[PDB]
Structures are given as C-alpha cells and as structure tokens.
Amino acid sequence: VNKQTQKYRTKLRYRFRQPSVVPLRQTLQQRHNTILEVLRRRR
C-alpha cells in the first residue's frame, strides 16, 4: 500500500478497536458493598 492507504488503514484500526473488557469497577463496587455490609452489620 502507499502512504494514503496506510494512513487510512491505521486510522480505521485506531477508530474501530476491540478493547479488553476487564470487570474491574464492578469488582471494586462489590467489594465496597461487602465492606459496607460488614461495617453496618458488625461494629
């Protein structure tokens, strides 16, 4: 490919990209809810 097609290919590669879906904020939210249940239920 030439320069124009290579630039358009990397533009389409950065535009349509499949990210890594790692459930991190839901893990921390479940940990927060468990800590709230412990702190409410036991003093």
Binding site: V21, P23, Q26, E37, R40, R41
Partner: protein, 163 residues
C-alpha cells in the same frame, strides 16, 4: 476475514432479534433514555446493538413492527433473547428487583414471588412460612420492625436526569 465488512440492515424486526442478543432501537431526539440503558447493559458486561432509527432506510417498516411487539409507542426498547424487555420503566424495575442480571446474561426473568430489594443484611425467609388461619393484622402487639425515617421536605435534585 473471508468476507468484506458490511453493515447489517434489514426491513424485518425478527431478523434483528435472531442476529443479536441485545438490540435497542432508539431515536436521536431522546438522548437521556438511551444513555441509562447504555449504563445498565454495559454494567453487566453484555454485548449490545444500538439501532438509531433516525436516518434509517426502513423506518416505517420498523416503526410498525415495534408497535406490534410493544403496545406502547415508546422509544427506546430493549430486546433480549428474542423477547421484549421494554422501556426505562421496565429496565429500572428489573434493576430494582435485582432481575436485570439474569435477564441480560441468560435471557430469562425470575418468577419467584417476593421482593429482594427490601432486605436487612443477608436474605432469608424470616416469616415467609404460611401462618395458621391467617390473622396477621389482628395481633396488635406484633413485631412492627425497626423505626423507619422519612424526609420532611424534598431536597433539591442535582440534575433533572440524575435519578
């Protein structure tokens, strides 16, 4: 890979249901109600196909068929596992009743009686057994529970779409 990439489009509603797991048909003039369903579905890590009905080639075929599956003319509509979930009043009810997890992930709704939203600590029965001869109200000295507090005046909400 073996075939060039093509955008999917069809004039039939069931062609969308048989293809995707979760389909949503929105309009561009309603940006808030589509954003709450985007927050709920992406919270449970579910792949979702959002179809903006503004600038579509089969608007009047799709606007007619969405009136048959859902009797209300309300957009957006969530469609999971070839079934109708509904608008925001139906999605927020399943999130409140803790049913939105198994609807989005496994395509079924819990038909279990009783609510799991009003729980104290862990969930148990705690009086779900049938009482002999009824008479739950004629015991006037019965255990009423912990004292519940209620607001005097409504505090000003931060946004009209904060919820």
């Amino acid at each position: 890979s073996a075939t060039r990439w093509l955008p999917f489009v069809s004039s039939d509603l069931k062609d969308y249901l048989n293809r995707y797991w979760a389909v949503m048909f929105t309009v561009g003039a309603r940006p808030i109600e589509t954003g709450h369903i985007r927050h709920y579905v992406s919270w449970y890590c579910t792949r979702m196909k959002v179809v903006l009905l503004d600038h579509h080639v089969y608007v009047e075929p799709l606007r007619q068929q969405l009136q048959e599956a859902s009797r209300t003319p309300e957009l957006p509509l969530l469609f999971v596992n070839k079934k109708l979930v509904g608008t925001l009043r139906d999605v927020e009810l399943l999130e409140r009743e803790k049913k939105l997890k198994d609807v989005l992930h496994f395509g079924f709704e819990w038909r279990v009686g009783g609510s799991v939203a009003a729980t104290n600590g862990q969930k148990s029965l705690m009086g779900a057994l049938p009482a002999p001869y009824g008479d739950a109200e004629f015991f006037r000295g019965r255990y009423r529970g912990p004292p519940v507090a209620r607001p005097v005046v409504s505090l000003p909400t931060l946004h009209p779409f904060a919820l």
